[PDB]
Design a protein around this ligand. Sequence first.
Ligand SMILES: *[C@@H]1O[C@H](CO)[C@@H](O[C@@H]2O[C@H](CO)[C@@H](O[C@@H]3O[C@H](CO[C@H]4O[C@H](CO[C@H]5O[C@H](CO)[C@@H](O)[C@H](O)[C@@H]5O)[C@@H](O)[C@H](O)[C@@H]4O)[C@@H](O)[C@H](O[C@H]4O[C@H](CO)[C@@H](O)[C@H](O)[C@@H]4O[C@H]4O[C@H](CO)[C@@H](O)[C@H](O)[C@@H]4O)[C@@H]3O)[C@H](O)[C@H]2NC(C)=O)[C@H](O)[C@H]1NC(C)=O
Ligand SMILES: *[C@@H]1O[C@H](CO)[C@@H](O[C@@H]2O[C@H](CO)[C@@H](O)[C@H](O)[C@H]2NC(C)=O)[C@H](O)[C@H]1NC(C)=O
Ligand SMILES: *[C@@H]1O[C@H](CO)[C@@H](O[C@@H]2O[C@H](CO)[C@@H](O)[C@H](O)[C@H]2NC(C)=O)[C@H](O)[C@H]1NC(C)=O
Ligand SMILES: *[C@@H]1O[C@H](CO)[C@@H](O)[C@H](O)[C@H]1NC(C)=O
Lengths: 150, 474, 167, 144, 473, 476
Amino acid sequence: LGFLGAAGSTMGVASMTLTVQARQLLSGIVQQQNNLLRAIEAQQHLLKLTVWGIKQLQARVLTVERYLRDQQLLGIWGCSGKLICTTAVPWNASWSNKTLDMIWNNMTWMEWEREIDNYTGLIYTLIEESQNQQEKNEQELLELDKWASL
Amino acid sequence: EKLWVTVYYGVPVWKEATTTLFCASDAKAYDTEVHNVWATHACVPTDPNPQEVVLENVTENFNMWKNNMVEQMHEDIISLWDESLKPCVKLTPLCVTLNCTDLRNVTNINNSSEGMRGEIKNCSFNITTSIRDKVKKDYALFYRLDVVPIDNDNTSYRLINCNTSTITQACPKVSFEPIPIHYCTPAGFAILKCKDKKFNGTGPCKNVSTVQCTHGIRPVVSTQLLLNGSLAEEEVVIRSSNFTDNAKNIIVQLKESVEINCTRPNNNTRKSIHIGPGRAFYTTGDIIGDIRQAHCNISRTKWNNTLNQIATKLKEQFGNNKTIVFNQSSGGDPEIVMHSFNCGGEFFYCNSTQLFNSTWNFNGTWNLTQSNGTEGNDTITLPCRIKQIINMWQEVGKAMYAPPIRGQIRCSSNITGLILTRDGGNNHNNDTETFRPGGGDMRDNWRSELYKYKVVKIEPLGVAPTKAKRRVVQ
Amino acid sequence: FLGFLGAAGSTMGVASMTLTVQARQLLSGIVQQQNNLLRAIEAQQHLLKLTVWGIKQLQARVLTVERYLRDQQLLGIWGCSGKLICTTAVPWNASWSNKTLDMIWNNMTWMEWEREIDNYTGLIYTLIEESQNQQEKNEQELLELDKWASLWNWFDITNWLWYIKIF
Amino acid sequence: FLGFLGAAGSTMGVASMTLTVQARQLLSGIVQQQNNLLRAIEAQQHLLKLTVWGIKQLQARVLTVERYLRDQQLLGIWGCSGKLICTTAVPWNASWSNKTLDMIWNNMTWMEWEREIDNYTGLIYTLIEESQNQQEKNEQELLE
Amino acid sequence: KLWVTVYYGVPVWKEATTTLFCASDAKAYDTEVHNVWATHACVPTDPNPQEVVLENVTENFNMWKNNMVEQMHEDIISLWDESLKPCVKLTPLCVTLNCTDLRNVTNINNSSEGMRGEIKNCSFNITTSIRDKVKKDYALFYRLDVVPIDNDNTSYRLINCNTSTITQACPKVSFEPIPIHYCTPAGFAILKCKDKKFNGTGPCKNVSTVQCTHGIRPVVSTQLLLNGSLAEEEVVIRSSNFTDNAKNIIVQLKESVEINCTRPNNNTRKSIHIGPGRAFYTTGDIIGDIRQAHCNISRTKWNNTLNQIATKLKEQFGNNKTIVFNQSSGGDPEIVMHSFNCGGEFFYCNSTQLFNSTWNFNGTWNLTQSNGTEGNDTITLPCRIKQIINMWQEVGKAMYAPPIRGQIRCSSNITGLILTRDGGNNHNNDTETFRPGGGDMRDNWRSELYKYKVVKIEPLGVAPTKAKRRVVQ
Amino acid sequence: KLWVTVYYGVPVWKEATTTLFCASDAKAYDTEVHNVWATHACVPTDPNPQEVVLENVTENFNMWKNNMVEQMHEDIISLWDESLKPCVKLTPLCVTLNCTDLRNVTNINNSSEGMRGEIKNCSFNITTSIRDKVKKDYALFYRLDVVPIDNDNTSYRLINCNTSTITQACPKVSFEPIPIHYCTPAGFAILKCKDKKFNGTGPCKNVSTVQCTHGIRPVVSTQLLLNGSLAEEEVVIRSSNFTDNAKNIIVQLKESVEINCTRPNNNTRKSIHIGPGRAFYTTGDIIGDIRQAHCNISRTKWNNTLNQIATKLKEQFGNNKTIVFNQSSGGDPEIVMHSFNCGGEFFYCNSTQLFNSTWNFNGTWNLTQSNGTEGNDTITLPCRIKQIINMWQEVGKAMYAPPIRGQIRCSSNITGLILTRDGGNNHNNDTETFRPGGGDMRDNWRSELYKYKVVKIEPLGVAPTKAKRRVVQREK
Ligand SMILES: *[C@@H]1O[C@H](CO)[C@@H](O[C@@H]2O[C@H](CO)[C@@H](O[C@@H]3O[C@H](CO[C@H]4O[C@H](CO[C@H]5O[C@H](CO)[C@@H](O)[C@H](O)[C@@H]5O)[C@@H](O)[C@H](O)[C@@H]4O)[C@@H](O)[C@H](O[C@H]4O[C@H](CO)[C@@H](O)[C@H](O)[C@@H]4O[C@H]4O[C@H](CO)[C@@H](O)[C@H](O)[C@@H]4O)[C@@H]3O)[C@H](O)[C@H]2NC(C)=O)[C@H](O)[C@H]1NC(C)=O
Ligand SMILES: *[C@@H]1O[C@H](CO)[C@@H](O[C@@H]2O[C@H](CO)[C@@H](O)[C@H](O)[C@H]2NC(C)=O)[C@H](O)[C@H]1NC(C)=O
Ligand SMILES: *[C@@H]1O[C@H](CO)[C@@H](O[C@@H]2O[C@H](CO)[C@@H](O)[C@H](O)[C@H]2NC(C)=O)[C@H](O)[C@H]1NC(C)=O
Ligand SMILES: *[C@@H]1O[C@H](CO)[C@@H](O)[C@H](O)[C@H]1NC(C)=O
């Protein structure tokens, strides 16, 4: 499988259904596809840099980077725990000037990002990452003096 | 009324992107261990069940002329071909004056000017093999197309492109048999399939699905007619970048398969002369039996109707009140002037005039016609001349010699598409539209199968405002 | 890798002593160490260039990476990317095995165990992540707001009280 | 505010609040972030048939991928995989430098402090490795 | 009591050696013409490079001990290797070359004015693709491309023949140096000494970082640095050991000196086919009078330029010094005569005038202007063409350059000088002599890479803190 | 109830096929001028390798189904391809060779010497870089590398010139085997069967595991095994199917038999430039008189060793059968004559003396000691020299060895033998006829990887436990 689909479904429908199940399946296929190729890599062992060989090699690297760079952001954003993570950054009117329903009932996830695109380059790139440092550094400052037991 | 960003991993959002696709062919070829195909040898296996999803409520824009896949596929098959003939003997030493005496069969009074007079020439030559101190006189039953008169002498001919290019003989063991190749996107990438029953090749495609792997796109390279390809659905579809422009080729996709029975009805014996240390040049020894002309059988009625269909679609595309002329290719490369393809490892330059000659008239009897007698329909036989020396389509410096396939050759290809070219030619008082069989540009052949595919990347990271807040600080 | 699995696979129990917790981290640690050694080499010789061996090491490096990635990815799917040994909420359908815990551990060795589960493997793994997701979404909505509780959490419960004195 | 290495001359404390800036560009690379090229090439096309540069770009990528992975593996061995700033139970042996926190975080910059702790790096890392082992023991008996 | 606190993302860097990749501008690929540097392979240059300034930071650079120099050295020579790898080998071409003094039998065009002997119209019987066919063919070789043989007045041969192969350069591949931007892989960085006058070694007052080098044109030139970067309001002189002799002296100029160079001869191309699919390109004939190649140089501009360098050299070797300029003593034409490439054509120019200048220590200060233009008294440099070019270091592996159709024109900017202080054994009380140098691709790379150094970034960091795990589950 | 618990790091492996990277000690890496089997690429081995003994572990090791032997073979073949790829080729030399003046004189040179004109001052009208000018040169060529042409008593050529391209090996490249440690990548492991003796297949009592294989020299030899490994306690015989006659019989000696081999001649190393930057390396003159190459075998030690394997051979086909060590049946010289490479020069040594003895167990004997240590203890092997090595797998791709200057001396360690049983009446005649064999490199690598089996380590595991994920068991 490995196909989220439901792209046409309203972002809210996608933010309510297939908001974790299909996404779990998507990642569950990424490792399978990999496992499958690995199973053959052992059988064929024709990893020789041929015309297709180099293609397979480039493809392998491309996928590795794709997964990591995504996980990297999540980890910095303190969202490595799971697919859906709530943050403490409030949404600036500049970013979007709509209502929760306007974005969930009258917007598709693709269309939604299309508008935020410009603002998104800062929403998570700077504000979200900065939020983590405050929390991280605070956690340390909090653990510096701690007594509360149960 | 307070919204806080909530990062969602797995959002169904994607972006148009170009990438390095990987081949995925049926493992049966690997098990057969033939590894003679110019590709598929290291190509990975194909997911037994193709994995596709119907993206309903999605109207992605599709453009054939802007499909990177086509450009990639082109370089791939080119590189695959170059790699296959990379470690094979070259005919650079065979570049000598060839005493092309008419073949004894050609002289034979039995075939009194019946046909094929000089088509197969018995050319003799002096060669220098591994022994650089001793020369050797050898004979090779070459073809007429491969040789070119040099001294205007009776039997003075030479291998075509002897100096213009480096003739490299493809290793005889290798097999030129296109087997379903499935181009697959690395993860995080997807191929979008224009599922529309009829698509203009450019513009928004409504009915739309996707695949992680292309369908078995056989890398069959054929000029004019498109054999063994994807059939059009219900309606013949004509696709062009600028229909108004004449320079651009016109890709016609047939809805029905015009099965073509091509054969080489000559029992042949392969001869091999050692030329260079451990390097053997393979040629023909003797033609066993009367020399007969290679031909292809096409049902006139079945094709006549085929043309009737393409003519109507062409009339709708242009002026329905216009005379349509299916003239023959007005000169050009031998590949373009005559339908060309490789059946059973031999390239058959077959005449396609009979197929593209009849000119339809508007305001006439378009009543589809049907056969009334077996002899009446018979078959459209094509005078075919086998050219072994094949130069690169878009490169002149590189030419590839073809090893003779000994024995009878025969194929059953299916005509699935046709390349055409509009040529207004200052039609007297317009009212006339001429069309000639187009060809060349390997990309044209690949476009007929990637017409629906569109590679896009995937971004499973999306931030959205949510009344919920991390609220982890407190 | 020096102490790579220093202790061999004994009864899953004896193997699951302090040995598993230590040997596993030690293996992961020394695996990281020898990998770091190879990079110290490449950072110096800088000769690895499409040679019979150069292609070998390059492909090997890629393999190790995707091999590690596949394992971690799985841990992620079923929300176990943190602790090496993570419990699940998936019950053992008797179909998977009738053996008692003692048979499973104080006798079965990880090597022969996976054999009698080879048919179940791909099934079980799918149940692990499936259950993880089922509760995950519910949990996401379960604690979605609860801002009221958070107030009492530092109003009454005083998550971070500053009243730290004696007597 | 500060650039990629903007807190290079800043004291350990000030730089501590800018850690993410560097962490964000550890894997993010020009060649990598390019994705689809405006060139006819597609993700380095076919490495241009292993060009002199084709292989270097290829090699460069693996090093970014393996290096980030090594880094992660380490924090993972130390447990705090996802976390950025962790808190070990390893007591700070004064042998590794006897300095007050004020000097360390309000005077010494990370670049300068690292030189002092350079010799005592592997020792410390293993001490964390075995501390997590002790932690795991405590957790196992707690679950029991 | 404190506890180790793992800090991920610490701003700490350490000197490292790693592979680098080129990022040429998109416009370079947009040319749609293959460049010997294969700029097409280079990744698209990021529109705006990010020059983060490292404030409160000082770093020790080693222009002479920078891996990147050695790396780029290998990269450039490998680039050329693969560029001419699949080109005609001109192997069979070498035979016996019977030659004439000029392509003009008499003063057909300008035999009197034309440099008699340079053309050396050599004719030869070469075999085409057809093995049984031999053809007499003629070609033009500058004296620098033919060696007299058999003592016969008319019998000659290719210069680097007998010795090594002389593969012709693939004609389509052009040789226009396109600025490349060596970029560090993620987790690595390049540090740029923003300090104005840097000796190439030692600490840096101002230091910045770039993930990508500034565009560097891979121009190879001798006794000069063409189209190079410019110093900052002060000519700078760098050498690992100034008190040594063999050490070549690098000089980066603060002011660019324009050098107009051209081949004033209209040429035609003749594709002599030598072997199947192998065509040797050669000059058919010069259309019009023959004029030797030259270069124009503003006496006054070069004057002031040397003046600035001379002073810097007295500052380097004791105030009181009569810095005297002299021409290369002897050796390979490469390092004896100033040579460079111009529009796909190598030029060996006799910069005799540029170094025919012995200066004392008094009255030399006055910076004379150009009151009397006199056509700028432009210095005209006698320039010739050596078609075959030997590998700078490798004895074997020579290469031929196919002729370009038509008059070639060039206008590079002088941006640097390579010098060799000769030991003051005697007669050198104050006559400090600096003969032109060169002969080493590395010396050119050091001049442009002095301000850069590559450091691995280690994001892992430890620190003591009163905080404790406090993890009791 | 029983909730499955995921355990990471479970000790589980699975027979797998993985790309292996060579790891050399990098001791001679500093000597870059020295080039041997791409040592420069081989990454320096771990300074302190550790072999974790697998206690209470038993594993099967099918040597004839090992993947390592296959990988070594492919890599070693490609290594030679890479070495000869940028080197010169003798396509022009394949000219009619007027071979005469076999020896300056047949006096002291051939008075009793068995040279009998093995070398020849062959002359030939070959061209050079000048192309136009053609010059005739003379070069001493071994009768082994030369083949007579026509009925002419002086027209000759190179054994493989007409049917195979000869590529001149680059002289700067050394040909001395180095300890190459085939190391497996992380996530994979090499099991090591430590049983004192092994049938070469079936379960293994003592089993261990190592991250890299022990140092294995890429030695290619025939009818013998040089600088190899030794068996444990006693000799071990190994075959896919011993009772089958075709299957080659692999033998591993428990004791090392020193073989002193040397070319006792001072050779001038002449060089002939043929083409631009293409110099053919040959021999100008043999300084002094010409002496044939020879190898020294301890007559007593070899008897004892042959008796040892003979006993094992009885233990394999019944004491009733007599052991008959006969000479090589016939075929290509590579196999007919024990042929190895000493000091970058390939030597062909007659092995009839080492394979000419009917042990006949019914004959009673114990061990043979050497009372006469001085003399009569050197089975001198008549060794001939060859420079044109035919490829072992393909007719083409022949290779020329540029002559070495001075005396070429070596002292390898015999460590086993490759044999061939001959099914026939001889066996019915109460006799096992074993003849030496070779020509299949796979056997050489099998003799060193015999105790190795690459397996992939899958840290992933599942296990029912009475513990549930309490992350779902949250509260207010
Ligand atoms: C491959 O496909 C082709 C295409 O279908 C098949 O061949 C087709 O066969 C058709 C007949 O079955 C034939 O149609 C006849 O065309 C003749 C000439 O066509 C032109 O002219 C007519 C009339 O226009 C006239 O008037 C205008 C002004 O209004 C003038 O400007 C013109 O100059 C003319 O003077 C047009 O209609 C056409 O479109 C063309 O412009 C006609 O003569 C013919 O009419 C009848 O007479 C024929 C004898 O003269 C007779 O053979 C034909 O059958 C017609 O018979 C009529 O009467 C009978 C009895 O009442 C009735 O049953 C018929 O139905 C009909 O009414 C036709 O119009 C196509 O021209 C022809 N096309 C080609 C390209 O050859 C071919 O068979 C097929 N092959 C296979 C193997 O399948
Ligand atoms: C979101 O913000 C935009 C920008 O202010 C609003 O669009 C403006 O609407 C007003 C009032 O009619 C106009 O005068 C402007 O010309 C609009 N500006 C732009 C940029 O479009 C929009 O109405 C807001 N949406 C809501 C419902 O809050
Ligand atoms: C090649 O053969 C043809 C046919 O025999 C020659 O053409 C003939 O030439 C003779 C003498 O000029 C004429 O009398 C005949 O009438 C010609 N016949 C034809 C059919 O043209 C030709 O001359 C020969 N030589 C060449 C040019 O190859
Ligand atoms: C060998 O054959 C003989 C036949 O006489 C038999 O007696 C003996 O047992 C067989 N095996 C041994 C152990 O020699």
